[PDB]
Amino acid sequence: KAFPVLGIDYTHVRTPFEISLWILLACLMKIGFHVIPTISSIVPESCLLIVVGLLVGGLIKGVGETPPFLQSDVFFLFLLPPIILDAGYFLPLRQFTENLGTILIFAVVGTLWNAFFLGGLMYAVCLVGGEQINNIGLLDNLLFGSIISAVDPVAVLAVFEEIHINELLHILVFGESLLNDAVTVVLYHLFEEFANYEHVGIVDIFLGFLSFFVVALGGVLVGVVYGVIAAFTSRFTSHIRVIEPLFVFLYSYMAYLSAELFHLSGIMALIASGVVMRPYVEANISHKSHTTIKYFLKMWSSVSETLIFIFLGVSTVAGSHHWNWTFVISTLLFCLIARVLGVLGLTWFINKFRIVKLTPKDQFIIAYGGLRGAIAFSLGYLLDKKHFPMCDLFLTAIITVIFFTVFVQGMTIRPLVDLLRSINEEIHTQFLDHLLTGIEDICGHYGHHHWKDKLNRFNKKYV
């Protein structure tokens, strides 16, 4: 072996080198996606991720490499918490807690409605469907409904602008996307366990109903504990500042792993930890370190979403498919109907319980514009084959729903929704505002203003 060291050993660097190649290709298409004059405001970013995944999967198929896969430990530990923490860190806590009621209604109740409505209707279709969609059952199909209701409406916000997206709809879709990705994972684990009980009684249904809230709220509690710890330890990192971002990421990640340790909701723990630490940081942290934290979250979430959509591409062009016309067409149509019915019903229920109503503009955007991706696919991809023997059909339905809801429901929402400050004003605005508040404080109904003032008193006390 002349020239001893020299070699061409490529097995040593395949996973890191090819993952770097994928992230490089996705980044190069992003810098080839914002240079086209007006295309970032016509087509969502998720479409670019889909197309990048399709090209990478096509390259993998053409070369002949065995396509890589999510290990169901890399997703739930290394690829999910980036996305969740990026989403739930820059949550506008003011707007989020002002109308927290409607956000919780949409996210939790609308996600449960989507999940159970899709489960029931897909079960009804399977019962009366061909011999290759029978024997799916209820729990195996209700789990599919819960997976496919993991929806990301906030991507549609990229297609709009400051106009048509008020501070109400923006926070509504933002919180809906967050807590929907939380509730769908909670339901995913719940149904994935219920699908091996072989006897689901009423007592088991009640226990699952309790465990839903126990998982979610235990995640919230772990998150606030780690957020308080991060808020405290951020006061002392003024001496060494390149460690300031690291403490935020470490404490959020440890909150996620402490929630997932006890099988609580890691996503809700991540969200709660970020939301708790954010106000008490950015005041104890320098501007440079806060700007970094922002950049870190953005690009690390972008890398994670890129990787998820690359896996989607490689499993849609180079994977196993079990296309069923009845199941796939029914799931497309029923996802649209379940989403629309949930949005309409819940908006009707909550307009009468609030001051600022939800216009048909934002009702249409929420109902038509909730687009799947990067969590629906990954949740439906990590389904076992031993359990859920039909999981290839579920993957085909989920991929078709993602493509239809991103390319047809996201590329045809802006050209489908536009067709369906004097000095006085300022003075008076502040005036009416101080007026209403005083009045609300006189009547006394314990709305949200009272709670926020109590929160502020608590904050002062701590400080």
């Binding site: 006085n424 004003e425 508040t437 709305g447």
Partner: protein, 185 residues
């Protein structure tokens, strides 16, 4: 059940809203004899912090009397009851409801006006602005803001154009959303 219907006609609330308000009333009574007075309002923890706080305490009061009864509290508080479209729309004869688009901005003018002389003036605007803003900001700054607002608002020419023009420059500002309170049952 006490006498509630006549206020349920005068004000226009429902029964549960009135019951909850009367509950808060009894809690804030801190004594039946001071059914409601100026000090009774002043010792509410938070409104006194509000810059307009003192004006709000004297804005309910009809005249110089220092006592408010429950019914008068209802009459003054109804001004905020949200405008209900079909129910403002069902029968049209006279503006019996006090929560109208007119009465809602009239409460604003009565809160600005020093006395009930309908005179918003540079003194009035300057006083309320100095209340809303802190004491630190320059009087020349407040002078500029207040007199600029007077100038643009005044089409009367006497610097007042007080109420009739108040409505016109606030018409661009939806008050149906801005100034109304939903009182939970």
């Amino acid at each position: 059940d006490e006498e509630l219907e006549e206020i349920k006609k005068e004000t226009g609330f429902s029964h549960s809203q009135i019951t909850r308000l009367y509950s808060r009333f009894t809690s804030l009574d801190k004594g039946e004899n001071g059914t409601l007075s100026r000090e009774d309002f002043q010792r509410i923890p938070e409104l006194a912090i509000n810059p307009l706080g003192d004006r709000i305490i004297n804005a309910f009061f009809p005249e110089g009397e220092d006592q408010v009864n429950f019914r008068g509290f209802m009459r003054t508080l109804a001004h905020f009851r949200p405008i209900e479209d079909n129910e403002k729309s069902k029968d049209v004869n006279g503006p019996e409801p006090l929560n109208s688009r007119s009465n809602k901005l009239h409460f604003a003018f009565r809160l600005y006006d020093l006395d009930k002389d309908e005179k918003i003036s540079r003194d009035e605007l300057l006083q309320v602005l100095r209340m809303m803003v802190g004491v630190n900001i320059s009087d020349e700054q407040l002078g500029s803001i207040a007199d600029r607002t007077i100038q643009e608002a005044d089409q009367d020419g006497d610097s007042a154009a007080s109420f009739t023009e108040f409505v016109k420059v606030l018409e661009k500002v939806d008050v149906e959303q801005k100034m109304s309170i939903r009182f939970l049952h």
